[PDB]
Write a protein that binds this ligand. Structure first.
Ligand SMILES: CCCCCCCCCCCCCCCCCC(=O)OC[C@H](COP(=O)(O)OCCN)OC(=O)CCCCCCCCCCCCCCCCC
Ligand SMILES: CCCCCCCCCCCC(=O)OC[C@H](COP(=O)(O)OCC[N+](C)(C)C)OC(=O)CCCCCCCCCCC
Ligand SMILES: CCCCCCCCCCCC(=O)OC[C@H](COP(=O)(O)OCC[N+](C)(C)C)OC(=O)CCCCCCCCCCC
Lengths: 55, 70
């Protein structure tokens, strides 16, 4: 009896999957963003003078 | 990837902003030995590195000699 949202309002979100479509929309946003992939071995990741490799 | 010369391997990996062809004369390495063409990794070939011991055996056997008794 102390809910802030009405039963119809809570049912509309529940039946129409309000947060599911919100999650789908965020995932679609990344589809139109630049990826992070680099093309090894044609490109190399960052290195520092302190890096330890072959002796 | 091993075909990249060690001079340009560091530049490709964003280790510096000065390419080896733009190096100052004092920043270059001084070699008293001659320089040959770059050799990549030689695995899966007949030129693969073969390890071996660089030290001689720690004991030497006696060279036998015969002396006749009087
Ligand atoms: C694919 C084909 C289509 C399929 C989808 C069809 C879509 C049409 C859906 C039709 C049914 C929707 C019914 C919505 C009206 C009834 C819901 C309602 O009004 O709330 C129930 C109400 C209780 O009141 P309450 O919600 O708790 O309000 C206070 C909350 N703060 O209860 C009442 O006071 C009245 C009781 C309900 C009377 C109407 C039923
Ligand atoms: C038209 C057919 C395609 C879309 C069908 C589904 C749409 C959502 C249905 C339920 C909405 C609802 O329940 O709305 C309510 C909710 C949340 O609002 P609240 O919490 O009440 O906000 C608080 C009160 N305010 C309003 C004053 C601030 O809204 C949503 O999360 C909307 C989702 C929008 C992003 C996804 C839209 C595109 C989906 C991907 C492409 C197919
Ligand atoms: C009259 C209009 C009819 C509408 C027809 C559609 C109804 C859909 C189902 C609504 C009920 C519901 O999703 O329920 C959620 C159920 C059961 O949840 P529960 O255990 O009851 O807890 C919730 C109830 N609370 C809050 C009172 C405790 O589980 C799920 O999370 C199911 C997730 C399915 C996700 C599939 C989405 C795939 C993508 C679709 C978009 C392209």
């Amino acid at each position: 009896e102390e809910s802030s949202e009405s039963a119809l309002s809570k049912a509309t979100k529940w039946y129409l999957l309000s947060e599911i479509f919100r999650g789908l929309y965020i995932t679609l946003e990344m589809y139109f963003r630049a990826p992070y992939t680099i093309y090894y071995p044609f490109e190399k990741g960052p290195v520092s003078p302190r890096f330890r490799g072959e002796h | 990837m091993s075909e990249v010369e060690p001079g340009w391997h560091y530049w490709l990996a964003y280790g510096t902003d000065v390419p080896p062809n733009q190096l100052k004369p004092e920043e270059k390495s001084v070699r008293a030995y001659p320089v040959k063409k770059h050799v990549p990794n030689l695995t899966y070939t007949d030129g693969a590195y073969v390890p071996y011991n660089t030290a001689r055996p720690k004991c030497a056997t006696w060279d036998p000699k015969v002396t006749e008794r009087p």
